[PDB]
């Protein structure tokens, strides 16, 4: 099984084109994955990816190429990487405010939602706590009493059974002695 | 490695003597293991077992025996099993009321404890439920709103980024075309 030379073009697409939308996707994941985003069970990345990949659009455009192309690509790779890398940074810059504004906005949204929710939730949790604190004290002496009685009941049983186990052991011993 | 002939005596001790206290232990486990017994974390069987086993007390009593003993024991085994089995049932009978009364008493105890506890616990669980029912309705429309906005924000970002990914793909395509 040989390896397609087009893998080199695929790598250039991933590294220098799709990185832009992937970073976009990562900013969205941070929203989806936040403590509050999970609270809401946000699923937001359906249809995020376009159907046709950047790689397909490149191969489709370049059309078929010769071995001269691949030898020329291998010749220019480092100089093309350098120049592609500066185009990528010039675009990353242009796009960064959108990503910044998105990150700040969903956090604003979540905070504004936390304010409407966390207080009412805190309250109920507080009162539930204070009513439970008021109940682990009433059943507290009730517990150490049941345990004392339970222990007394078991010691009584253990004691009641003892003479009967002795009687059995003595009947066995006497039957065994008869085999001497 | 040979096997001790005394294993036969050990088996008789287990089967026809220790079964009595073991059943006792099983009645206690039922208490310990009940839904309410677990609630209280009952640990009740410490020191239940005597230090010296019935087997040790039998061997200690019989003292050393001959091969004639083991041949005689093998001769009488079925007739000794039958007769030991009827002694065991005559004792099981004598002891059963104790086990019955113990089982009935710890259940009485647990019920009497359930009455003091379950109501107060039910109440708090009811009100906590009714206050939460009163809160999953207020944040309900708030949730479907945040989701709509979240979806709108992500579609905006996806859209803002598109022309920049196209520009990158076009700069790569043009650099690749130059290698033809």
From Swiss-Prot, chains A, B:
It is found in: Secreted. The modification Methionine sulfoxide is found at residues 84, 110. Residues 42-180 are annotated as: 10 X approximate tandem repeats. GO terms for cellular component: blood microparticle; chylomicron; collagen-containing extracellular matrix; cytoplasmic vesicle; cytosol; early endosome; endocytic vesicle; endocytic vesicle lumen. The keyword Membrane does not apply. Changing residue 1 to H: In Munster-3C. GO terms for biological process: acylglycerol homeostasis; adrenal gland development; amyloid-beta formation; blood vessel endothelial cell migration; cellular response to lipoprotein particle stimulus; cholesterol biosynthetic process; cholesterol efflux; cholesterol homeostasis. One of its GO terms (molecular function) is chemorepellent activity. Transmembrane segments: none annotated. Major protein of plasma HDL, also found in chylomicrons. Synthesized in the liver and small intestine. The oxidized form at Met-84 and Met-110 is increased in individuals with increased risk for coronary artery disease, such as in carrier of the eNOSa/b genotype and exposure to cigarette smoking. It is also present in increased levels in aortic lesions relative to native ApoA-I and increased levels are seen with increasing severity of disease. Keywords: Amyloid, Amyloidosis, Atherosclerosis, Cholesterol metabolism, Disease variant, Glycation, Glycoprotein, HDL, Lipid metabolism, Lipid transport, Lipoprotein, Neuropathy, Oxidation, Palmitate, Phosphoprotein, Repeat, Secreted, Signal, Steroid metabolism, Sterol metabolism, Transport. Changing residue 172 to S: In AMYLD3; plasma level of HDL and apoA-I protein were significantly lower in the patient. Changing residue 101 to N: In Munster-3A. Sequence repeats lie at residues 42-63, 64-85, 86-96, 97-118, 119-140, 141-162, 163-180. Changing residue 66 to I: Confirmed at protein level. It comes from the Eukaryota. Glycosylated. Participates in the reverse transport of cholesterol from tissues to the liver for excretion by promoting cholesterol efflux from tissues and by acting as a cofactor for the lecithin cholesterol acyltransferase (LCAT). As part of the SPAP complex, activates spermatozoa motility. It is linked to Hypoalphalipoproteinemia, primary, 2: An autosomal recessive disorder of lipoprotein metabolism, biochemically characterized by severe apoA-I deficiency and severely reduced serum high-density lipoprotein cholesterol (HDL-C). Affected individuals have undetectable serum levels of apoA-I, and develop xanthomas and corneal opacities. The disease is generally associated with atherosclerosis and markedly increased cardiovascular risk. Hypoalphalipoproteinemia, primary, 2, intermediate: An autosomal dominant disorder of lipoprotein metabolism, biochemically characterized by partial apoA-I deficiency and reduced serum high-density lipoprotein cholesterol (HDL-C). Affected individuals have half the normal plasma apoA-I and HDL-C levels, and may develop xanthomas and corneal opacities. Most patients do not have increased cardiovascular risk. Belongs to the apolipoprotein A1/A4/E family. Homodimer. Interacts with NAXE and CLU. Component of a sperm activating protein complex (SPAP), consisting of APOA1, an immunoglobulin heavy chain, an immunoglobulin light chain and albumin. Interacts with NDRG1. Interacts with SCGB3A2. Interacts with NAXE and YJEFN3. This is Apolipoprotein A-I. It comes from Homo sapiens. The lineage of its organism: Eukaryota, Metazoa, Chordata, Craniata, Vertebrata. The gene is APOA1.
């Amino acid at each position: 099984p040989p390896q397609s030379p087009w893998d080199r073009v695929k790598d250039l697409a991933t590294v220098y084109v799709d990185v832009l939308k992937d970073s976009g996707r990562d900013y969205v994941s941070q929203f989806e994955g936040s403590a509050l985003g999970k609270q809401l069970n946000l699923k937001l990345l359906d249809n995020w990816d376009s159907v046709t990949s950047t790689f397909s659009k490149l191969r489709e455009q370049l059309g078929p190429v010769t071995q001269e192309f691949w030898d020329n690509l291998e010749k220019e790779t480092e100089g093309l990487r350098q120049e592609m890398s500066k185009d990528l940074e010039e675009v990353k810059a242009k796009v960064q405010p959108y990503l910044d504004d998105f990150q700040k906005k969903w956090q604003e949204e979540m905070e504004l939602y936390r304010q409407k929710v966390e207080p009412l939730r805190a309250e109920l949790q507080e009162g539930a706590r204070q009513k439970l604190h008021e109940l682990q004290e009433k059943l507290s002496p009730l517990g150490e009493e049941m345990r004392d009685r339970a222990r007394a009941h078991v010691d009584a049983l253990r004691t009641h059974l003892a003479p009967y186990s002795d009687e059995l052991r003595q009947r066995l011993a006497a039957r065994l002695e008869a085999l001497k």
